[PDB]
Amino acid sequence: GYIPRAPRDGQAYVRKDGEWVLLSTFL
Numbered sequence: 001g002y003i004p005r006a007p008r009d010g011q012a013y014v015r016k017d018g019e020w021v022l023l024s025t026f027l
Contacts, residue, residue: 001018013020 003018004020006013006020008020011022012024014023
């Protein structure tokens with residue numbers, strides 16, 4: 001799949017299969 005825009009500018013997005021996810025929230 002295509003990798004969408006990563007708004008990592010305040011949201012630490014971890015790498016998943018074509019997915020961007022905020023991780024900070026976890027820890």
